[PDB]
Design a protein around this ligand. Sequence first.
Ligand SMILES: C[C@]1(C(=O)O)[C@@H]2CC[C@@H](O2)[C@@]1(C)C(=O)O
Ligand SMILES: [Zn+2]
Ligand SMILES: [Zn+2]
Length: 315
Amino acid sequence: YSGPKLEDGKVTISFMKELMQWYKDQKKLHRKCAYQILVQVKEVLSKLSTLVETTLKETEKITVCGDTHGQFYDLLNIFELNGLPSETNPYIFNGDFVDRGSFSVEVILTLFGFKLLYPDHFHLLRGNHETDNMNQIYGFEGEVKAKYTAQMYELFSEVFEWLPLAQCINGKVLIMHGGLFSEDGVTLDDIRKIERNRQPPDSGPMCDLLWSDPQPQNGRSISKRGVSCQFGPDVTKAFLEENNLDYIIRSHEVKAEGYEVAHGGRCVTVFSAPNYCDQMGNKASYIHLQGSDLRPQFHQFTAVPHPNVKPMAYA
Ligand SMILES: C[C@]1(C(=O)O)[C@@H]2CC[C@@H](O2)[C@@]1(C)C(=O)O
Ligand SMILES: [Zn+2]
Ligand SMILES: [Zn+2]
């Protein structure tokens, strides 16, 4: 084996550079190195709150991405358009890193390496696809078994359970994959206290965080997805008021332009998988936020070429 190796058993910037190129060229990280990454990142993630709370100083910026769904070559394109992660260039990836796209292993191990290299400046939040039920149907479980083993898949499932469920920037912007709640009165402290190391329940706030969607009319509706609900602009306004927040940023729905701003400004969708499943034809975006001005700035981008492997090839 002549591929990327850890230095004195730890990730370094020179290792991360070697790995992205290794993967671009369709090569596999040695199982021993993938193991060390998974055990080290479980350790780091298991120490974090369910609600990650981040302060951005007035000269600091952060980038927010939505669903990536194993589109590794579009992930590389984000880093080329927007720069490598670093202490001065932090990132948040907002769930659904795996499933649907056929380079989910490359996406998740690159994201984990950067989490290890920059633990205070590189942030991962759980999506509805970081779960067993979903991985078993939509491709990730099949992909890991094909490249590694069932055992390695079990380790991934365990690591995913330690992903935090939401992130609050400067006590003003709350970020989750799905959205708000099926009941009125949920608070930030309620989120902090969720015992998250598990597969999510069929109902309740951990379910809602990963699964809900906005609707335009006031009220709530039963979801067409069969779990959680659709929430109206009355629900969003009430939640922001109680928790002294400005707005929310969520993902979980494909948008033709890469983003959407619903509820009069209060409920932003960001989606980071362009030409989703090689079929949608949609643009993607990421958001920039700055400590001195937390209003979202949208940066759009389009799909780049990838090797000839079809979506869901491992599903
Ligand atoms: C179809 C999708 C998925 O299965 O995750 C994929 C396309 C939009 C969004 O991401 C989606 C609806 C989601 O469930 O989060
Ligand atoms: Zn989703
Ligand atoms: Zn998704």
